[PDB]
Amino acid sequence: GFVCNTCPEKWINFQRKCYYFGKGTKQWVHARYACDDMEGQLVSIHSPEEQDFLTKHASHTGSWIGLRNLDLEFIWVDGSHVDYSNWAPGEPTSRSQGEDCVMMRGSGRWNDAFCDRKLGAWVCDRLATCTPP
Fold first, then answer.
1. Is 91 annotated as a binding residue?
2. According to DSSP H, which parts of 1-133 are helical?
3. Residue among 74, 75, 60 at smallest CA distance from 105
4. Does 93 appear as a known binding residue?
5. 7, 18, 32, 35: which could join 124 in a potential S-S bond, CB 3.0 to 4.6 Å?
6. Is the peptide bond before 92 cis (omega within 30 degrees of 0)?
7. 125 annotated ligand-binding residue
């Protein structure tokens, strides 16, 4: 096994991951289950290179991402902590209470909005399968 760029039908390869750029009106939790029932998760961005690819295919309206708030601290759906951050200027707002779910704007910048908000786009990500040369 050396080459990891093997994608299922309708998924787009980037680096060592597969991405599905889903459409249709969905609440954060609804988009959380849309990927889980597809054998994927809501997207976890960890590199500027990943973000740049994501921005290129993402809908201008705004896509849900796998980041959310708790208590403590923002953590991705995979459980990973935030290392790379592409927050919009002045984000995350530490006064807007209830805005615990993160979305990604057309520009790629992330905004933290209400979980009950209906967005037209949502991005999923899974691991890319391998091939032995």
1. yes
2. 28-36, 48-57
3. 60
4. yes
5. 35
6. yes
7. no
- DSSP readout, 35-64? HHTTT-EE----SHHHHHHHHHHS-SS-EE
Is 22 in contact with 122 (CB distance < 8 Å)? yes
Q: 3-class SS at 101?
A: strand
CATH superfamily of 11-128: Mannose-Binding Protein A, subunit A (3.10.100.10)
The secondary element (H helix, E strand) that includes residue 123 is: strand 119-127
Token pair in block for residue 15: 């680096």
Are 58 and 123 in contact by the 8 Å Cβ rule? The answer is yes
Q: How many CB atoms lie within 10 A of CB 129?
A: 14
Experimental method: X-ray
Named by the residue before each, gaps in the chain exceeding 2.5 A from C to N are 72
Q: Resolution in angstroms for this experimental structure?
A: 3.2
The full set of domain ranges for the chain reads 11-128
